[PDB]
Design a binder for these strands. Structure first.
Ligand SMILES: [Mg+2]
Ligand SMILES: [Mg+2]
Ligand SMILES: [Mg+2]
Ligand SMILES: [Mg+2]
Ligand SMILES: [Mg+2]
Ligand SMILES: [Mg+2]
Ligand SMILES: [Mg+2]
Ligand SMILES: [Mg+2]
Ligand SMILES: [Mg+2]
Ligand SMILES: [Mg+2]
Ligand SMILES: [Mg+2]
Ligand SMILES: [Mg+2]
Ligand SMILES: [Mg+2]
Ligand SMILES: [Mg+2]
Ligand SMILES: [Mg+2]
Ligand SMILES: [Mg+2]
Ligand SMILES: [Mg+2]
Ligand SMILES: [Mg+2]
Ligand SMILES: [Mg+2]
Ligand SMILES: [Mg+2]
Lengths: 183, 172, 90, 169
RNA sequence: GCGGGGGCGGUGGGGUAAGCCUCCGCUCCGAGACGGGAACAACCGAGACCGGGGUUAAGGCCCCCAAGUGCGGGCUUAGUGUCAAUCUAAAAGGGCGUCCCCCGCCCAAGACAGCCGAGGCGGGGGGCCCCGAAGAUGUACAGGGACUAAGCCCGCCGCCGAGACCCCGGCCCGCGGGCCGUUGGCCCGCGUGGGGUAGGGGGGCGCGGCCGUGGGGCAGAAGCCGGGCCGUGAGGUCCGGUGGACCCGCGGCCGACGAAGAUCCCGGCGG
RNA sequence: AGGAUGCCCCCUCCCGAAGGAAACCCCGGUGACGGGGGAGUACGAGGGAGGGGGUCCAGGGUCUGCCCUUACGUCUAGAAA
């Protein structure tokens, strides 16, 4: 069974692992909280699930054009595999890159903090089949829904910038939905 | 004859970059280091000097209790020794409160005895002999508002009124 | 969404009276209401309060707008919420 | 001619003493008061419109002339000369200089660059202040829309922002 | 030394303008450490003997990054924008796009749209935003992540934050006083004393020799390799190994007297 | 050749500069927070004393983490250039 809780920012354990359900949360604010948690607890591991349900505020066309420009115009003229940037598209890798942007750069501390994080789309079967899955929410990073407000999900962004991979992942979800509901 | 108001003046800004006329006036006013405080008689020449150095200091009307506490905590004598109550009674002053009240009320015209002062026998001198004529304050607890803006606009510089006593207590 | 209405029992979440319960007696505007979580009962002085600084409870008494502390106590006796009111959350 | 932005800004003392200025240009503006200029007939007019400067700067004589023609032509075509008085209130006393190598203009103009850089006269301008009244129109109250349109067209030809102020005489 | 420079002010005078030329004044760099500004001589703060404790200045407090996902009201939908300058920007003009202020008129419910029944029309102005708005290696650039507030306006509360300010310990300096047979040494007192290039002044270390004086050495001198201790330092001294005959402490005096550099000289030797 | 009468840990005791809290109670503010008491208290650089436990401590080579940091000499207003 999944038990939902609110993450006490002063009551973070110094050891072990914590799982954060990312649905309904704003990507930048949640990334800021996750980066500070990883920097402040050097021995704690952080798992983020439901990364495709993260929210980016603003117009859908504006966000999609921003991501398209990032994945298309940003390149290199040297050896691309040796020197160029490599831009993620999938929502979990996008969120991990967003956290890497907030972690310290070119340092072993930043590298170790990034390595102590795992991000998943949806909830994995291994996590579901546990006896008691404690999920967390960070209320400060949750979007307050208001009428006439504009926002998009990382899943919608991924579908716009990579329809075939999204189709394969959605089909996999439909294929394993029976076993998921069983677990 | 006239008893002018007794003012506390505290230097708030620093020794580098300050303009020359203001620096000269501060040196003549004995505010030669940052967070130096002086107590002056508000005669017109002194008020002209304070108006000249308005943008580098803050000033106000000091009260007798704050002056007594300033003498107790930050008072210094020649050789940089602390000023002691037994030293006051030796010179003929019964207490910090009494000497501060005399100075603020205008029974005496100076707090520190001048360099040319000569001490007789038996008489109570009208100052504190061999007291240094300036105090060196601590930085203010809880900070200030702005050392670049006037107090009248929400900053810290300029005429402060009787709030100089609150500032002095925070700075003690 | 948060709903604040006259007679609603709320809990103050900011200030020195944080965790103490009070009753909404009047509405100033869209952002402020009047609460007297009586000083003789819960220790909440009759004052205005921002909507962001109170969380509504699930119990409500019936009172007129800006009702006095006597009327608020009378409605509290009617609803049987004196012991609920005296409790302190967190 | 150079762009007017080269001479818009007031950057030095006024240069107006024509007894000391060599080869000072003439003022090319042919007339300054438009319409019914006699005060006996101006007694009919009761509304005053004023095109007024918003910034401090210099207006060239050609710019003042172009604004004058556009406003006067509109006022003649749509209000008739017997129904308005229009005055260009400023005179281009200031003399503009330009530093350029050129034809027979002195032996010191044949040295290139910034050597002997005091320029020769290049035109005339009127130095104006904020709130200065550039154009003054007296008119009967029925022609308010036409007068405002003429002032707008005049303002389109000037190098500084302005505004229209309407009041009674 | 007689090459100055930066910021601000004289609409300084000139010039289209210039990180442009030439004057006047304060300050700073040159010759000034340190905090902030994303880097950055002169922009803001601030003036540094050494070690430690504390408190503040500028500025900041979502993460990078110490300190607030701080508080009240309002505006913006453009990722506009993201807390002065260097530093990477923007004009005339258009827009009830949106929020608001004022004024003239009509409506006495017979006002604006074509009997209906409650507001309508016109003008001026203010705030934010939109168009005007086009470049060359690589992303909504002006720190990056990103943010719908972590943007902007009117106010507010606390905190973080320098070598600055306060305190303690140590050191040194200037000046005055005192004691000692003294080309000198020691002690005490006072200082809103403690940055510093060129340059001026004062003291000391080292190298070769000479005049004295006192010594070490085949039971191992000089030299060489590593190491401990002393001294702010120049440097001194000792230990272990190697080596095989000279060397050193102290006072005085004298010099062919101190190297990291000269497209340095000579030699040896590398990639 | 240095200390080993050392070093480190724990505990306890004493003194202690500038500085200096917290719960909790009371007054005020929408609020972040301010104020009276708690309290110049607990604590606080450092200075003394003692108890037990252990073996090296200083020092050196190399490497790692965090913080800091723009080769040298020179002309120059200006040198990492
Ligand atoms: Mg491709
Ligand atoms: Mg590869
Ligand atoms: Mg300054
Ligand atoms: Mg000029
Ligand atoms: Mg010269
Ligand atoms: Mg200068
Ligand atoms: Mg900096
Ligand atoms: Mg932090
Ligand atoms: Mg322009
Ligand atoms: Mg932009
Ligand atoms: Mg010095
Ligand atoms: Mg000798
Ligand atoms: Mg050399
Ligand atoms: Mg050679
Ligand atoms: Mg070779
Ligand atoms: Mg030994
Ligand atoms: Mg050179
Ligand atoms: Mg040069
Ligand atoms: Mg030089
Ligand atoms: Mg150099």
């Amino acid at each position: 069974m999944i038990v939902k809780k609110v993450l006490d920012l002063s009551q973070i354990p110094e050891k072990g692992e914590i799982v954060i359900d990312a649905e309904g949360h704003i990507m930048g604010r949640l990334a800021s909280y996750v980066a500070k948690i990883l920097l402040s607890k050097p021995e704690l591991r952080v798992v983020v699930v439901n990364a495709e349900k993260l929210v980016v505020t603003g117009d859908r066309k504006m966000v999609v054009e921003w991501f398209m420009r990032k994945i298309s115009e940003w390149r290199t003229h040297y050896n691309p595999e040796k020197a160029g940037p490599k831009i993620p598209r999938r929502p979990d890798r996008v969120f991990k890159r967003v956290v890497r942007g907030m972690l310290p750069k070119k340092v072993e501390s930043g590298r170790d903090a990034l390595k102590r994080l795992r991000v998943y789309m949806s909830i994995p079967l291994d996590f579901i089949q546990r006896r008691r899955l404690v999920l967390y929410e960070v209320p400060a990073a949750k979007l307050r829904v208001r009428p006439l407000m504009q926002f998009v999900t990382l899943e919608e962004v991924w579908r716009s910038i990579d329809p075939a991979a999204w189709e394969k992942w959605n089909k996999a979800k439909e294929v394993w939905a029976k076993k998921i509901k069983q677990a | 004859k006239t008893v002018y108001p007794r003012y506390a003046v505290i230097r708030l800004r620093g020794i580098p970059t300050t303009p020359g006329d203001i620096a000269a006036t501060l040196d003549l006013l004995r505010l030669r280091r940052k967070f130096t405080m002086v107590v002056v008689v508000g005669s017109p020449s002194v008020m002209g000097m304070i108006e000249r150095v308005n943008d580098w200091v803050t000033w106000g009307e000091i009260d007798a209790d704050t002056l007594a506490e300033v003498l107790r905590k930050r008072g210094r004598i020649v050789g940089d020794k602390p000023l002691t109550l037994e030293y006051l009674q030796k010179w003929g002053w019964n207490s910090f409160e009494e000497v501060a009240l005399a100075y603020i009320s205008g029974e005496i015209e100076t707090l520190a005895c001048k360099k040319d002062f000569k001490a007789r026998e038996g008489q109570r001198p009208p100052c504190i002999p061999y007291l240094k004529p300036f105090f060196r304050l601590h930085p203010p607890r809880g900070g200030l508002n702005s050392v670049k803006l006037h107090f009248s606009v929400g900053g810290d510089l300029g005429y402060r009124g009787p709030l100089i006593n609150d500032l002095i207590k925070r700075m003690l | 969404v948060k709903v604040i209405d006259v007679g609603r029992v709320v809990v103050k979440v900011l200030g020195r009276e944080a965790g103490r319960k009070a009753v909404v007696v009047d509405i100033v505007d869209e952002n402020y209401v009047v609460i007297t979580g009586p000083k003789s009962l819960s220790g909440v002085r009759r004052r205005r309060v921002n909507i962001n600084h109170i969380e509504p409870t699930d119990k409500k008494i019936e009172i007129k707008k800006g009702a006095s502390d006597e009327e608020v106590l009378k409605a509290l006796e009617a609803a049987g919420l004196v012991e609920y009111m005296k409790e302190r959350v967190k | 001619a150079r762009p007017a932005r080269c001479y818009r800004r007031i950057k030095g003392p006024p240069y107006t003493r024509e007894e000391y200025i060599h080869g000072a240009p003439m003022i090319q503006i042919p007339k300054f008061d438009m319409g019914t200029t006699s005060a006996a007939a101006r007694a009919a007019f009761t509304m005053v419109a004023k095109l007024v400067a918003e910034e401090r700067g210099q207006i060239r004589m050609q710019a003042l002339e172009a604004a004058r023609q556009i406003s006067s032509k509109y006022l003649t075509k749509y209000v008739g000369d017997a129904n308005y008085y229009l005055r260009l209130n400023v005179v281009p006393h200031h003399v503009l200089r330009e530093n350029r190598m050129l034809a027979m203009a002195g032996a010191d103009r044949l040295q290139e660059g910034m050597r002997l850089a005091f320029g020769s006269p290049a035109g005339r301008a009127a130095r104006v202040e904020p709130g200065q009244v550039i154009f003054y129109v007296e008119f009967k109250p029925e022609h308010l829309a036409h007068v405002k349109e003429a002032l707008r067209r005049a303002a389109s030809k000037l190098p500084i922002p302005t505004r229209i102020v309407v009041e009674p005489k």
